[PDB]
Amino acid sequence: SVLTQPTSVSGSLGQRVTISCSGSTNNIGIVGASWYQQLPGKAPKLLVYSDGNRPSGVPDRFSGSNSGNSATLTITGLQAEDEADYYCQSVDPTLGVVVFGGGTHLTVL
Amino acid sequence: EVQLVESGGDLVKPAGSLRLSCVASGFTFSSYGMNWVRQAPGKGLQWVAGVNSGGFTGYADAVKGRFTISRDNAKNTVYLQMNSLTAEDTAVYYCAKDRYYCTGDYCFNLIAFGYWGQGTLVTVSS
Amino acid sequence: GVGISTGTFNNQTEFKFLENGWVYITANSSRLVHLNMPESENYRRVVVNNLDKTAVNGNMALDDTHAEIVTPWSLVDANAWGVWFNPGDWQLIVNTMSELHLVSFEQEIFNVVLKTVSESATQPPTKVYNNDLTASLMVALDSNNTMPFTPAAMRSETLGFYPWKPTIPTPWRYYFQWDRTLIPSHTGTSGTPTNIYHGTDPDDVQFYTIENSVPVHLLRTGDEFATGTFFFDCKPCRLTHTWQTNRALGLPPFLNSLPQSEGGTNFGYIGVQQDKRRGVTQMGNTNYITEATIMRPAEVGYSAPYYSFEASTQGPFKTPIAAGRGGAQTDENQAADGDPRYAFGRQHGQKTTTTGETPERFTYIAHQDTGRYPEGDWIQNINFNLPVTDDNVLLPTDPIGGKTGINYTNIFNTYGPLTALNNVPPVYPNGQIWDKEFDTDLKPRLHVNAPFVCQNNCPGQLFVKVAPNLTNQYDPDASANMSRIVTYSDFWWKGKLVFKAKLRASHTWNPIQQMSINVDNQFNYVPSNIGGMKIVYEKSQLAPRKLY
Amino acid sequence: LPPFLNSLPQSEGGTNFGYIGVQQDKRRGVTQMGNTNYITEATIMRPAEVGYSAPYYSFEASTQGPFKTPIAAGRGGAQTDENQAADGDPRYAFGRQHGQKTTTTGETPERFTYIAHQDTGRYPEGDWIQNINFNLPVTDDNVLLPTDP
Amino acid sequence: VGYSAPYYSFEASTQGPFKTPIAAGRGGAQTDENQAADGDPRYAFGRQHG
Amino acid sequence: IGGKTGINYTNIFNTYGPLTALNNVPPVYPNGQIWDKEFDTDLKPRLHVN
Amino acid sequence: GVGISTGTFNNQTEFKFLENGWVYITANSSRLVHLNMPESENYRRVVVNNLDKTAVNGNMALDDTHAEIVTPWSLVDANAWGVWFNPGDWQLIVNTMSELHLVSFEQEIFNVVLKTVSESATQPPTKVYNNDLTASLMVALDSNNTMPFTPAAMRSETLGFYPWKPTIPTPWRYYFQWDRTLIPSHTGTSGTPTNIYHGTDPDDVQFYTIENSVPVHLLRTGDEFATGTFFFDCKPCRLTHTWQTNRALGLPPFLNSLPQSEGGTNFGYIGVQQDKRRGVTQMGNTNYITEATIMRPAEVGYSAPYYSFEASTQGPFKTPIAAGRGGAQTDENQAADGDPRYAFGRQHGQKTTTTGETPERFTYIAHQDTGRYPEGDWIQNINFNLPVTDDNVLLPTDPIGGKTGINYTNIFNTYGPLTALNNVPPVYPNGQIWDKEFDTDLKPRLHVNAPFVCQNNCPGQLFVKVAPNLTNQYDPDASANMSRIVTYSDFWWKGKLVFKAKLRASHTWNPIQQMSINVDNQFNYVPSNIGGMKIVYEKSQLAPRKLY
Amino acid sequence: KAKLRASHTWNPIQQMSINVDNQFNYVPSNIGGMKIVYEKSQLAPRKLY
């Protein structure tokens, strides 16, 4: 099982950005996705949990939601700090396999 | 604060074997699982294996028949053993911690990596 | 020996009348118990996790997650009123008795039969049953109460209620420790709440084994097992109910006007203006002495948070309440939190000729008026200016936390040092009789499941198991399952339960409520034309007693 | 007595669970909910209540001023994560006579929070109230969650 | 020492509403009697009784 | 609480628990009652307020 | 009779406390034992000779050549710790006791069932199991110890460790006399080393039969056999360990410079020049009094030639050593000669649900510090000129006989009149409990296999056998195997082993090592979801005691 | 006055022990330092019901 993400998403400073991850009833329909941030060449950072909570210190700009077999990450008030790569992560309970998405590159205009 | 440090990167032949190690600190090591996630050059993250408190392990279908992962809670260390390596295994391998407290056989139903290390490079080539 | 019986069948009830209005009720129960060999001879640690049902936001109450040890042993449980009393016995007890004591309990197993099953190789299947005179039935009595207490009335798994129908013992299991978290949600919650099974705490592990804790007796077809008489130390159980709420305690007000003609609208009047009255109130800043405001000795009943679910290490559970709802006697549709609901099968009351997996159910509405009618509660400011204005009163029709369906009485607790309440009434036939007291340092004032609670100890649990019947190919080093001859046992169980009851006295001019047969319930107590039977439920605390 | 499992696992692993088998509204047992057929582990009757919930970090006032409302039991999940030790877990502060390393300089006391092994606490983030009707799945208006102001 | 209770709380049962009793009096009423409230019993009597 | 400017949490607040200590009601001279009868309930109140 | 049981199953452990801190530990063990009729009713004299394996030069240590007598009897051996104690009882013993005494042993066989197997002539095979009520089980107790002592723990062939798992006895066989010569060699050795089995010396032939030496009891389905209580005469077994080597005996040197600050490198200094110190040494030609050279009362432990193989008439065998290696407690990879290695199967601890013929193994690392660190030793010339020159010191680095892999410590023995050593600790669950003393004029000081050694004699071996069940076509003049009805027996074994133990006392400020359940080992002590069980090895001498 | 415990279960229970981590909490420092670390007391489990 693999998750699906769009290759890239573009937004302009101060606007709203949405990144979408698609899965199945087996992976995202039971355990929602968790979103990660990766600066070029750096270790990933967790942004939003599967329940919509954020790690301490993450701005409220970042938010997530789950509907059916698809999950989305919403970045509000896009700043220059957000130019990076983002990934969706979910775990398959039926098989016991952790599934990452293909990744999406975010472009700030 | 939680901190992780990896090691063990090297260059090996297209049919060799290798072993990697991480050292952790700052939390109740026995309560949280530790996982190995790799990233091929220019590609996305890929999960390799994970091990929980009692020694129970989970392997992705890509490495399930080749690799092995282990812990030592008395030393806050996690090891990964790789055998029958192939070129596709070339990647930087990242050591991470789970947000959720799971110990025994019935883990891998909810995983979310909350802290990360620095990564180590694995290269498989002639 | 092989051809000699080791006991007698007795399902009689005896009423020996002692001096001073006391009766010695002896209840004998005899059953034919059918026991198959266990599916495996091993102890299993099994974990249930219905993440599919709980992953639906708002279904957090349907959580079934738990860990348990599944044992090869079976439990012979007779802790239900139907095992001992038939409807006539119950009618006698609840019509003629005022209080009920639990005295003693003994049981025995006799006339053990062990058989084997062999299937022919004939193309049309055929099978034969043979006696195994040398096979043994393993029997263990946990007289020291070392094993976890697992009363079967909770799962409707006691012995059957019919003397003429064979019964089975419930396979035995007990809870193994686990840690679980389930963050609640509602239809429309954004994201998937945290729904995780955490594992097991090593500091709480307890793997119990019957072999290592209890002596085990091997019974052949000519052997018998008797437990001995155990004597209880419980408090008496009342067969009377209280109707008095706080409004019915003490001296009523003097009516300076009384009606001069009978009729529905011909009321009496106190005749004293309310702020000009005499009496005592617990409200130091008002002169109004009314029935609602006059001082009473104490409280009868207590408001509790209803359908409140509390979380601990093992997950959510409903907050228990000791009394039923108010107004439920008048309208059964209003029966809710506190009115116990029983679901049971064909061994325990459901019409025996019915087909299907759907159980028979009833909600037990008790006669005692110790409940609350939350739609009639209200808080108001301490100033107590009447008539009260909107801003100075909290009504049950008022949203708490922004919710139109949650009001203050859902999170309301009025239990205090002044609360008075009764023990739960017995429920015939599916109600549990006695329960073990918690081994906590500080103990609950009552149990919601049984009217009798055992202070020091009460009788050990009786476990049975067909002894292994191996073939000639056994190899203990094999990883596969044990090769056993298909063996099963039929044995007779007899128990004696002794009660002490006090005959009632007529204190009032009027007659009291009594249980009787009538044209409507006439055919709930006799077999059908094809032999079907049912045992409907009966109320226990029929007679009224004065609270104060 | 746990529920009888009609399906048992045939292999070892983290995904091999046991199943009760009986549908939830078709089950047998005793509940204190006279208006529903669901017999579940969260709804089945238990003899009594182990522990209680208390108002946490509640300060009450009397003639002498405000004081904390005491609690007899610790928190839930404190053993899992010591950073969650809170109301109910006694915290002891002491000096060099009574345990603090005797060779250390400074006026700062040595401290520890005591996390008892007894599981009688509560996980208030897991509690909820819902309307008496008990229609499932519960809708927003008919549930009071710990997430609600 | 002591407890907090819902004050001027009226609870209903089969027979109708009644005030929830409280086992102790108010605080600060000793200094200013105008604050005597829930928990401080009030007695009304005639010429035979004082 | 509940949107009411005149009702606060203390109105619906109960802190009775296993750590509560309280005294029995004092005699009230002359109008106070002297003795009272115990309730015929199975579980009895810890005191009577009258 | 046929249908009356002749015994009760009991597998409890009782801790009866006595005066002065002594506990009477009574361990009860009960098993179901499955016995098949022997391959043949005749005694055999069988010679094993693995010339193929030892024909390869360098494989001499893999010699399996011997001669044995294969008897038709089977041995019911309970001489292993796991037969009597579960992990919890072992925890209690090893954590709360200081010494253990072996008191008494008794066993009884009850509830004998003999069954026969019949196979149908139907084209699809099928078979049925019938009771043979007149069949007998032959039981022999060798109370006089006439037969060779063949304890089964050495081959991992004792009774199983699980009360709920049926067990089997081991087919009994004993050694015959043989003469063997096997000249050692190595890869690259020219020619074929002498590898010859020489036969039997008539002066040493001893052919024992059970029938001619022991009374045999014929047990039918209604019979029981009880051995009677045997009483031991062993020495106490210590549940404490000693840490003091020679370097930790006596009065440490006075430090004239104590450290002024905390730290790992903030050491203390004696402050007296080494050649100007006061004390006693056995070095009469040197003024240096140093911790290595200071006199000590005696020697703790001794050095022995490790992986030494000695040859006698019957062939090469390893020279045993009473103590384990040094440094093995810090690095498990250094466990070698002296640390016992236990290889066992699914009856005796291996996870019961695993397939395959590979056994479970562990190497026991005792807590006692009586061993040696051979790479830390050296010998230097009697002159004692320091620093020592190459020609005046023999190091473990230096060769012996021109071999780069053999050093003087391999051929080194330091046992003498000053050697002090400890008894072997109990090994749970796979260790022997008791052993018989050698019938030599001069006896060994300790046995390396069982903590208890029986001075005079101790309990006779129990032998079982299914009596031959002949068909109607028996002919003793025929040379072919006797034609028997395929018969197997299932009987219940119950044993009682009684110890006396002393409760320990705290002698130090600090707490001591204790065995505990932790999150790492949590699931070694509970069953799996499919019933799998394992028993893991536990240490015994956890607490320390001062040697001097 | 205290009662000795009994083994009720197949598995062992939680016990207090000295280990490589807590070792130096029970012995003095090279300059005479002492400390007493807190220790739990209800280690063993008992069945409530």
Side-chain angles (χ1 to χ4, degrees), chain B residues 9 15 24 31 37 41 43 54 58 61 64 75 77 90 102 104-105 118 124:
Chain B
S31 305
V37 177
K43 310 300 187 179
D61 295 337
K64 188 165 181 177
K75 301 190 184 89
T77 298
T90 297
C102 192
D105 336 44
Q118 189 61 227
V124 180

Side-chain angles (χ1 to χ4, degrees), chain C residues 189-298:
Chain C
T189 294
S190 53
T192 88
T194 292
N195 184 352
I196 182 165
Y197 174 91
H198 287 139
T200 300
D201 188 340
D203 314 303
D204 302 343
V205 174
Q206 287 193 300
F207 174 32
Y208 292 94
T209 292
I210 296 287
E211 289 83 353
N212 287 93
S213 300
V214 194
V216 178
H217 289 81
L218 307 183
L219 305 182
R220 279 165 167 176
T221 188
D223 266 289
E224 63 283 87
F225 172 76
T227 62
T229 316
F230 178 97
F231 295 94
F232 294 88
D233 59 5
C234 310
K235 309 170 333 311
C237 168
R238 316 295 272 296
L239 296 167
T240 49
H241 76 264
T242 55
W243 65 266
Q244 283 177 279
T245 72
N246 270 54
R247 287 278 286 255
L249 301 175
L251 188 67
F254 186 69
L255 306 184
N256 287 283
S257 186
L258 296 173
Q260 305 297 300
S261 100
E262 263 218 12
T265 56
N266 265 76
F267 303 114
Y269 309 93
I270 297 165
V272 202
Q273 155 158 358
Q274 303 210 263
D275 55 328
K276 253 70 154 143
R277 288 184 190 166
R278 309 173 195 170
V280 194
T281 67
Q282 277 219 302
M283 317 186 21
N285 60 330
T286 187
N287 295 325
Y288 291 119
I289 317 199
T290 76
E291 295 288 347
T293 58
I294 199 172
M295 177 187 270
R296 309 290 179 163

Side-chain angles (χ1 to χ4, degrees), chain C residues 243 245-247 277-287 289 292 295 299 303 369 371-373 376-382 412 414 417-418, chain E residues 3 6-24 26 34 36-47 49:
Chain C
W243 65 266
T245 72
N246 270 54
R247 287 278 286 255
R277 288 184 190 166
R278 309 173 195 170
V280 194
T281 67
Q282 277 219 302
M283 317 186 21
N285 60 330
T286 187
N287 295 325
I289 317 199
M295 177 187 270
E299 190 131 356
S303 295
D369 296 6
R372 289 289 183 274
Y373 178 53
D377 302 14
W378 78 91
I379 317 294
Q380 65 186 115
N381 212 41
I382 193 80
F412 197 53
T414 53
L418 298 176
Chain E
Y3 70 111
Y7 50 91
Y8 290 6
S9 166
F10 283 88
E11 293 188 318
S13 192
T14 319
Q15 265 97 72
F18 57 86
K19 198 197 86 77
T20 305
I22 171 180
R26 302 287 283 194
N34 189 49
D38 180 28
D40 301 310
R42 187 161 179 79
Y43 289 75
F45 45 99
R47 277 176 269 297
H49 313 101

Side-chain angles (χ1 to χ4, degrees), chain C residues 413-481:
Chain C
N413 191 346
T414 53
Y415 181 74
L418 298 176
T419 294
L421 70 156
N422 294 331
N423 199 8
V424 294
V427 176
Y428 176 85
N430 304 88
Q432 185 178 336
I433 305 183
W434 64 85
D435 207 7
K436 218 190 88 199
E437 199 37 296
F438 282 9
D439 203 5
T440 57
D441 296 293
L442 297 152
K443 277 152 226 271
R445 298 186 71 189
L446 80 160
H447 281 27
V448 297
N449 61 319
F452 299 102
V453 175
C454 312
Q455 295 199 359
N456 292 274
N457 278 300
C458 62
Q461 291 168 131
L462 183 63
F463 304 98
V464 299
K465 175 188 176 291
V466 176
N469 223 55
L470 303 164
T471 66
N472 70 305
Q473 298 189 319
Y474 182 58
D475 170 336
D477 282 310
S479 60
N481 259 285

Side-chain angles (χ1 to χ4, degrees), chain H residues 26-46:
Chain H
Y26 310 97
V27 293
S29 75
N30 63 337
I31 68 181
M34 275 279 99
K35 76 151 92 46
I36 309 184
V37 293
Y38 78 117
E39 303 269 312
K40 320 259 192 67
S41 57
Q42 296 187 339
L43 308 180
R46 76 163 185 290

Side-chain angles (χ1 to χ4, degrees), chain G residues 174-213:
Chain G
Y174 63 83
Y175 282 110
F176 205 61
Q177 200 269 9
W178 77 96
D179 292 307
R180 206 268 204 276
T181 302
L182 176 56
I183 297 294
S185 54
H186 61 70
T187 57
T189 279
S190 57
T192 51
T194 296
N195 185 348
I196 181 186
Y197 170 92
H198 275 137
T200 201
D201 174 273
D203 320 301
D204 303 304
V205 173
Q206 285 205 304
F207 172 43
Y208 307 87
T209 65
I210 292 278
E211 292 86 302
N212 281 29
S213 313

Side-chain angles (χ1 to χ4, degrees), chain G residues 5 15 31 55 92 98 139-140 150 157 207 211-212 254 258 263 294 360 365-366 389 394 402 404 433 486 490 508 513:
Chain G
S5 275
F15 288 81
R31 294 289 186 279
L92 194 59
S98 67
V139 177
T150 64
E157 286 181 351
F207 172 43
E211 292 86 302
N212 281 29
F254 180 80
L258 292 168
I294 194 168
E360 183 63 289
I365 316 300
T389 326
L394 190 63
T404 56
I433 305 181
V486 179
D490 293 352
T508 53
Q513 189 198 24

